[PDB]
Design a protein around this ligand. Structure first.
Ligand SMILES: *[C@@H]1O[C@H](CO)[C@@H](O[C@@H]2O[C@H](CO)[C@@H](O)[C@H](O)[C@H]2NC(C)=O)[C@H](O)[C@H]1NC(C)=O
Ligand SMILES: *[C@@H]1O[C@H](CO)[C@@H](O[C@@H]2O[C@H](CO)[C@@H](O)[C@H](O)[C@H]2NC(C)=O)[C@H](O)[C@H]1NC(C)=O
Lengths: 49, 66
């Protein structure tokens, strides 16, 4: 639910959508995430590993 | 995540894409307000092969009828 559960009821949203929203938060726009989603997922998995 | 009108992903400049089952709209994040998906509220940047989960739908040009 992203940040929505920190305000009221949890708002079920897809994770790619939430990540694109987070990118929009820092002035990167959604297109970057939706064009690099595989790279971002791989980088996140490598960092978590 | 995006809408493919003619081989081009249309992402929403502010807000998310929603569909009431059949018709897709653009609404804000913290309040449901459906708006017809035009070129004003959507910016096109992509190829429509890389994004995953893109729906086709259609966009409305506010200048073509005029
Ligand atoms: C989703 O909402 C749209 C409204 O934008 C519905 O389209 C119809 O739009 C006309 C406008 O001339 C209304 O008079 C109709 O009442 C709308 N239909 C309905 C059922 O309300 C569209 O039908 C809606 N989709 C669903 C599945 O309800
Ligand atoms: C969305 O529009 C695209 C536009 O490219 C269409 O994709 C077609 O998919 C079929 C099946 O692989 C191909 O044979 C065609 O060449 C593609 N393009 C066209 C213009 O037909 C299709 O109309 C829609 N696809 C989806 C998944 O909704």
């Amino acid at each position: 639910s992203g940040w929505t559960f920190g305000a009221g009821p949890a708002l079920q949203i897809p994770f790619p959508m939430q990540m694109a929203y987070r990118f929009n938060g820092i002035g990167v726009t959604q297109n970057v995430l939706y064009e690099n989603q595989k790279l971002i997922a791989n980088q996140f998995n490598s960092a978590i590993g | 995540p995006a809408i493919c009108h003619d081989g081009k992903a249309h992402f929403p400049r502010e807000g998310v894409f929603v569909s009431n089952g059949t018709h897709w709209f653009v609404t804000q994040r913290n309040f449901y307000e459906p708006q017809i998906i035009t070129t004003d509220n959507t910016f096109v940047s992509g190829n429509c092969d890389v994004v995953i989960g893109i729906v086709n739908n259609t966009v409305y040009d506010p200048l073509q009828p005029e």
